[PDB]
Design an enzyme around this catalytic site. Structure first.
Site, PDB file in Angstrom:
ATOM      1  N   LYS A  33     -41.448  42.144  16.481  1.00 30.58           N
ATOM      2  CA  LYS A  33     -41.882  42.674  17.779  1.00 30.58           C
ATOM      3  C   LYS A  33     -43.008  41.884  18.455  1.00 30.58           C
ATOM      4  O   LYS A  33     -42.726  40.937  19.158  1.00 30.58           O
ATOM      5  CB  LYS A  33     -42.193  44.170  17.683  1.00 30.58           C
ATOM      6  CG  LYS A  33     -40.958  45.039  17.336  1.00 30.58           C
ATOM      7  CD  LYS A  33     -41.209  46.531  17.453  1.00 30.58           C
ATOM      8  CE  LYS A  33     -39.948  47.367  17.113  1.00 30.58           C
ATOM      9  NZ  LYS A  33     -39.461  47.104  15.728  1.00 30.58           N
TER      10      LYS A  33
ATOM     11  N   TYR B 216     -28.763  53.049  21.333  1.00 35.11           N
ATOM     12  CA  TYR B 216     -28.589  54.448  20.903  1.00 35.11           C
ATOM     13  C   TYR B 216     -28.255  55.421  22.029  1.00 35.11           C
ATOM     14  O   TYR B 216     -28.961  56.410  22.210  1.00 35.11           O
ATOM     15  CB  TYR B 216     -29.836  54.938  20.133  1.00 35.11           C
ATOM     16  CG  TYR B 216     -30.081  54.216  18.826  1.00 35.11           C
ATOM     17  CD1 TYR B 216     -30.706  52.994  18.767  1.00 35.11           C
ATOM     18  CD2 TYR B 216     -29.624  54.777  17.633  1.00 35.11           C
ATOM     19  CE1 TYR B 216     -30.886  52.343  17.574  1.00 35.11           C
ATOM     20  CE2 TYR B 216     -29.803  54.138  16.429  1.00 35.11           C
ATOM     21  CZ  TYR B 216     -30.436  52.911  16.410  1.00 35.11           C
ATOM     22  OH  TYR B 216     -30.617  52.253  15.218  1.00 35.11           O
TER      23      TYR B 216
ATOM     24  N   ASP C 291     -43.797  46.804   5.720  1.00 37.24           N
ATOM     25  CA  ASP C 291     -43.060  46.503   6.938  1.00 37.24           C
ATOM     26  C   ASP C 291     -43.985  46.719   8.124  1.00 37.24           C
ATOM     27  O   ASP C 291     -44.195  47.857   8.572  1.00 37.24           O
ATOM     28  CB  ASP C 291     -41.821  47.387   7.057  1.00 37.24           C
ATOM     29  CG  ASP C 291     -41.020  47.124   8.340  1.00 37.24           C
ATOM     30  OD1 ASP C 291     -41.517  46.420   9.236  1.00 37.24           O
ATOM     31  OD2 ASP C 291     -39.866  47.578   8.535  1.00 37.24           O
TER      32      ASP C 291
ATOM     33  N   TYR D 121     -38.655  53.878   9.002  1.00 36.22           N
ATOM     34  CA  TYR D 121     -37.657  53.128   9.781  1.00 36.22           C
ATOM     35  C   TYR D 121     -37.846  51.648   9.510  1.00 36.22           C
ATOM     36  O   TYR D 121     -38.955  51.147   9.600  1.00 36.22           O
ATOM     37  CB  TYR D 121     -37.736  53.430  11.291  1.00 36.22           C
ATOM     38  CG  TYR D 121     -36.772  52.566  12.080  1.00 36.22           C
ATOM     39  CD1 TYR D 121     -35.418  52.849  12.088  1.00 36.22           C
ATOM     40  CD2 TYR D 121     -37.213  51.443  12.776  1.00 36.22           C
ATOM     41  CE1 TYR D 121     -34.521  52.055  12.796  1.00 36.22           C
ATOM     42  CE2 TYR D 121     -36.337  50.650  13.467  1.00 36.22           C
ATOM     43  CZ  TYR D 121     -34.985  50.956  13.475  1.00 36.22           C
ATOM     44  OH  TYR D 121     -34.089  50.161  14.142  1.00 36.22           O
TER      45      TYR D 121
HETATM   46  C1  LIG Z   1     -38.544  47.929  15.269  1.00 33.73           C
HETATM   47  C2  LIG Z   1     -38.702  47.855  13.781  1.00 33.73           C
HETATM   48  C3  LIG Z   1     -37.793  47.197  12.971  1.00 33.73           C
HETATM   49  C4  LIG Z   1     -36.562  46.514  13.520  1.00 33.73           C
HETATM   50  O1  LIG Z   1     -36.710  45.373  14.407  1.00 33.73           O
HETATM   51  P1  LIG Z   1     -35.486  44.875  15.320  1.00 33.73           P
HETATM   52  O2  LIG Z   1     -36.001  43.627  15.912  1.00 33.73           O
HETATM   53  O3  LIG Z   1     -35.264  46.008  16.184  1.00 33.73           O
HETATM   54  O4  LIG Z   1     -34.360  44.641  14.379  1.00 33.73           O
HETATM   55  C5  LIG Z   1     -38.008  47.193  11.592  1.00 33.73           C
HETATM   56  N1  LIG Z   1     -39.103  47.829  11.059  1.00 33.73           N
HETATM   57  C6  LIG Z   1     -40.006  48.477  11.867  1.00 33.73           C
HETATM   58  C7  LIG Z   1     -41.203  49.170  11.304  1.00 33.73           C
HETATM   59  C8  LIG Z   1     -39.807  48.495  13.231  1.00 33.73           C
HETATM   60  O5  LIG Z   1     -40.617  49.079  13.962  1.00 33.73           O
END
Ligand SMILES: *Cc1c(COP(=O)(O)O)cnc(C)c1O
Ligand SMILES: *Cc1c(COP(=O)(O)O)cnc(C)c1O
Ligand code: NA
Ligand code: NA
Lengths: 428, 428
Positions: free
Chosen positions: B274, B17, B245, B144
């Site tokens: 992550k 970004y 998520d 997000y």
């Molecule tokens: C960082 C994140 C993603 C995306 O993961 P990437 O490995 O960057 O594609 C999706 N959902 C949440 C809540 C995130 O924090």
């Protein structure tokens, strides 16, 4: 590895494109070395697949191994936001240098599908920046570009069952599948489909996206390079971006470093993956031109709006750097050429089998298309019993082995395929 | 890393970004150890970011390293089609075991965005198999879910600049961002917006997707668990799938193993990423219920239609296994609790600062929201000069340190933040 393990896998672990209620056997692998995979029970298999294209230097390769271990000792990963590091710079240096001149801006990502999503977003943001209403993609039928929504939207609608997302996925434009063969003659009559679509929609097309020369997952088709010349000219003339998806063809697989070279053209955007890391771990790259990168940055957004958490992962970058360093030796060229000749010679006989529709070969890809679909469980078992690992799909029995494969090992793969097609046992 | 190397990076390497025309300073990192990043000039920075949430065990962890090196000796990678292996099995046992009961089927994928894409495709196929016309997603504002097209379609229309893709993205349903704070009382007026949407479209919704408790990239917002309790119930009543998520909240970060616990509820679909690998390399997981996984398979497509090339990657799986083994010791619980206390205590004073709009803390997350945006280049530089690595954005200066950070290291972070917000220097 125990049977309880296998039972846990079956009842709780999803695998690629396969049912959960009605699974098909899976074989336990404990390790892998050279061109061989090793099952839990000690059985050694010659890998004819390179673990789906990627493992072009085979398994447990000393240079890849050493590169990976040394990177772990520095740092496996550090975030790429506001930070840069040697494995990423080195890799981007290599990627810029080995690809056509205009391609000099590198966006590293985690997977091939994501690389394609990146390419598609670049195209979209590019036109938004120029104030032009271009949101559509023109792609070939029989194409495959990934499993995420964006990529799915440019995959063959029949080959990917678009009736599942009918209404969710944007409707892009699908030109006929290239009919002229890499092997044969060109035929100008092949272009009418694409010309018609382009003429009727020039003003709304953001990009043309295609797999150069080989359409892999959508049929292992091998088409004539004139197609790419033509497409590149049409895109130039119309001011439309060309996206070459080389996630499968990249890094020597078709006998040229990148399949675009068969036509001597350069896309505006290049997607790479699979063999990028030498099949050690996932990494992808999307390269574009200055014109594209700068236009995007100078528009409303002020940047290209993408950034995977693990972007530029040092470990994966070190592995890739080492994979590319092997290729720099130029050895792959004769290795692939020799594999080509050997696939042609040894698969030829399959043409006389009753069950065989077609036999085509390009670089280190040899394909036996069948008249009926394969019986998965059955054929996979047969192949294991022969001491080879071959993963057939639909009416396709194909080989994409590591470049270092020994002529004897390849002879084994070829004998097994020939033997598999000699009757209908393994069909339906 | 020569100056020429850094020149090459600025001109040719896209970072997350950011502009390729008006590039902002990056810092060259050669290695990392403990909770410290080491630059090319030898200078050490205490890492307040965990390389974006993921490195919960810091860097160069002896355990992670040995597990990675060991897998490399067996096999860094092998394909997952028709093949299973120990690391994937072990990893999937742990995920099933550590998550709520109903979640027993694991789809391993490469990255977060893909895990979300996977979750979204499950929901669509689930309703496809039941012959129900459901293709809308209901989510929260300020959410997000990743950068791929599907994930972007449930991301905040503003934060993610949907204007750019207007016409390409399916238009989903966005309920107001959770008003009630995890720090405060519950106002039932908070539910109107959501209810209004859930009614007029209960016939259309395939799934509700939200990040539990912490809306991360969308604003580092912290909302009350009651929202989860209520959302689950509403989903149960309408028979709507709930997708949680937890790619950012998973594995300890908020004070609970999984954020969903704060409300003792269980999603129909759970996304992990992550921190899954202890921040060594990319890997994700999407878990779901037997009901969902079977429905889809016994559906018309015959299987779940998705399969990344590097699915189940042994190296990543073994890094993840090592990372979860560290969490198994249970230390993270008090490590995080202590961090929460220190963050609460040490960021408190930022509330007397003129540039500060709000201070909020939850688990190993400390957030100082400012009244004006930060000057990225200037602030990052300040932080680096103070011997710390902090990656601020928009109006948020936040910290998500490794769980193993020493109190004096945490102290240099919070002092650096407090010093940064005293006046306008590093702002606008
Ligand atoms: C960082 C994140 C993603 C995306 O993961 P990437 O490995 O960057 O594609 C999706 N959902 C949440 C809540 C995130 O924090
Ligand atoms: C394998 C492949 C992809 C996608 O890669 P994943 O890493 O599986 O997401 C995209 N395009 C082509 C041509 C491929 O072969
Ligand atoms: Na180039
Ligand atoms: Na569970």
């Amino acid at each position: 590895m125990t049977t309880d393990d296998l039972a846990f896998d079956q009842r709780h672990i999803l695998h690629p494109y396969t049912s959960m209620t009605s699974p098909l056997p899976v074989y336990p692998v404990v390790s892998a070395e050279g061109c061989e995979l090793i099952l839990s029970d000690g059985r050694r298999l010659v890998d004819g697949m390179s673990s789906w294209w990627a493992a072009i230097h085979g398994y447990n390769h000393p240079q890849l191994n050493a590169a990976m271990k040394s990177q772990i000792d520095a740092m496996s990963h550090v975030m790429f936001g506001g930070i840069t590091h040697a494995p990423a710079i080195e890799l981007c240096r290599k990627l810029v240098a080995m690809t056509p001149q205009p391609l000099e801006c590198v966006f590293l990502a985690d997977s091939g599908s994501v690389a394609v999503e990146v390419a598609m977003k670049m195209a979209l943001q590019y036109w938004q920046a120029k104030g032009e209403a271009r949101q559509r993609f023109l792609t070939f039928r029989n194409g495959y570009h990934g499993d995420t929504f964006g990529a799915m939207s440019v995959c063959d609608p029949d080959n990917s069952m678009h009736s599942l997302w009918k209404g969710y996925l944007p409707e892009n434009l699908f030109a006929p599948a290239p009919q002229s063969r890499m092997d044969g003659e060109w035929d100008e009559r092949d272009m009418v489909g694409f010309a018609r679509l382009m003429a009727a929609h020039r003003h709304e097309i953001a990009a043309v996206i295609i797999e150069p020369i080989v359409q892999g997952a959508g049929g292992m088709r091998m088409y004539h390079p004139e197609w790419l010349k033509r497409i590149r000219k049409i895109c130039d003339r119309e001011g439309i971006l060309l996206i070459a998806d080389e996630i499968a063809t990249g890094f020597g697989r078709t006998g040229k470093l990148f399949a675009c070279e068969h036509a001597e053209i350069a896309p505006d955007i290049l997607c790479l993956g699979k063999a990028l890391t030498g099949g050690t771990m996932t990494l992808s790259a999307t390269l574009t031109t200055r014109e594209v990168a700068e236009t995007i940055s100078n528009g409303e957004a002020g940047c290209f709006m993408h950034g995977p958490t693990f972007m530029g992962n040092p470990l994966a970058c070190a592995a890739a750097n080492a994979s590319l360093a092997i290729l720099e030796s130029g050895d792959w060229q004769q290795q692939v050429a020799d594999i080509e000749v050997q696939l042609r010679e040894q698969l030829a006989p399959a043409r006389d089998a009753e069950m065989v529709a077609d036999v085509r070969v390009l670089g280190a890809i040899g394909v036996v298309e069948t008249t009926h679909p394969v019986n998965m469980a059955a054929l996979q078992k047969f192949f294991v019993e022969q001491g080879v690992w071959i993963a057939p799909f639909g009416k396709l029995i194909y080989l994409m082995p590591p470049y270092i494969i020994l002529p004897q090992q390849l002879q084994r793969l070829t004998a097994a395929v020939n033997r598999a097609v000699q009757d209908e046992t393994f069909f339906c």
